[PDB]
Design a binder for this molecule. Structure first.
Ligand SMILES: [Ca+2]
Ligand SMILES: [Ca+2]
Ligand SMILES: [Ca+2]
Ligand SMILES: [Zn+2]
Ligand SMILES: [Zn+2]
Lengths: 174, 161
């Protein structure tokens, strides 16, 4: 399973559900769907109030993009950003999932109130190669991966892609 | 328990689907070094089939494509694959809603493909970011001297010696 991890903004905007929760148990594997399930408890909800949820579903094996919870729960709260498919919260290897306390303030702000600001006219665009190519005034080029080698970098931890005026989005600080 | 590995050293493969992103010649080349990268450090071998059932079946697809795990259009998941075994086990799948490239100016088939083959051979994801078995698309400046991580090597040699 090969991913391009997304920016936190992109995680937020394109997730149906964004919650903070603790993993409470071992995964249970449901053959019949090819998916496994983690029992969580939702400690706050940021996106999705068109729901009340206490399970998380992901594929059963790593190779096919299944998420394995490394932590064994200090009662770490985890930020989970994922899709609602047929009532169920779904995540994969590629989904944005991370311990809450490891996020910067700049990310906590944003997930709380600042990300939804640029959600749907602005786009964060991942740069693979370094010609890169900007698509439009509404795209921000995400260069953390190329420049510092890992998506856990500056644009991702302190910046968001917000409007300046209509037709123009720009990297902006939280 | 349960440590999946091919019990046969001599393996077989087939490119069944092709992407339009690249020439039909490009797709093939990409796959060859993908396997040769593993072949180099193991006693494995690979033979190509153009017909019928190969062990590792290579496919390009979009969204629903005959398994439990729909692709998700442009981005995010680029590909996935299956551990050794019969049938869909061993196969590898690629999301054609990506733009597969011979170079790194997009999503490099060779790089993605060799990672997924590693799965088909029985390896899991690594936590080392330089490892080919790392799940986040690396995308590097000169494919010339891409090298197999030592983790990678140890992993595949631990399975096949
Ligand atoms: Ca995809
Ligand atoms: Ca197979
Ligand atoms: Ca394509
Ligand atoms: Zn993988
Ligand atoms: Zn598939």
């Amino acid at each position: 399973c090969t991913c391009v991890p997304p920016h936190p903004q992109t995680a937020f905007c394109n997730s149906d559900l964004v919650i903070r929760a603790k993993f409470v148990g071992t995964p249970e594997v449901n053959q019949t769907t090819g998916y496994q399930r983690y029992e969580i408890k939702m400690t706050k909800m940021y996106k999705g109030f068109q729901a009340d949820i206490r399970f998380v579903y992901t594929p059963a094996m790593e190779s096919v993009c299944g998420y394995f919870h490394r932590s064994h729960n200090r009662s770490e709260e985890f930020l989970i950003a994922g899709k609602l498919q047929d009532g169920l919260l779904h995540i994969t290897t590629c989904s944005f999932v991370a311990p809450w306390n490891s996020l910067s303030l700049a990310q906590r702000r944003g997930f709380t109130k600042t990300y939804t600001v640029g959600c749907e006219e602005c786009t964060v665009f991942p740069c693979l190669s370094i010609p890169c190519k900007l698509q439009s005034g509404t795209h921000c080029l995400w260069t953390d991966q190329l420049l510092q080698g890992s998506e856990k970098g500056f644009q991702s931890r302190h910046l968001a892609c917000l409007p300046r005026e209509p037709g123009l989005c720009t990297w902006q600080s939280l | 328990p349960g440590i999946p590995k091919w019990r046969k050293t001599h393996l077989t493969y087939r490119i069944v689907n092709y992407t339009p992103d690249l020439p039909k010649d490009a797709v093939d080349s990409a796959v060859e070094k993908a396997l040769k990268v593993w072949e180099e450090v193991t006693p494995l071998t690979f033979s190509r089939l153009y017909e019928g059932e190969a062990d590792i079946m290579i496919s390009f697809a979009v969204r629903e494509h005959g398994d439990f795990y729909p692709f998700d259009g442009p981005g995010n998941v680029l590909a996935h694959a299956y551990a050794p075994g019969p049938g869909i086990n061993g196969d590898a799948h690629f999301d054609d809603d990506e733009q597969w490239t011979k170079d790194t100016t997009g999503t490099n088939l060779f790089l993605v493909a060799a990672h997924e083959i590693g799965h088909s051979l029985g390896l899991f994801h690594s936590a080392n970011t330089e490892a080919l078995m790392y799940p986040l698309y690396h995308s590097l400046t000169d494919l010339t001297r891409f090298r197999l991580s030592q983790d990678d090597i140890n992993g595949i040699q631990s399975l096949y010696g």
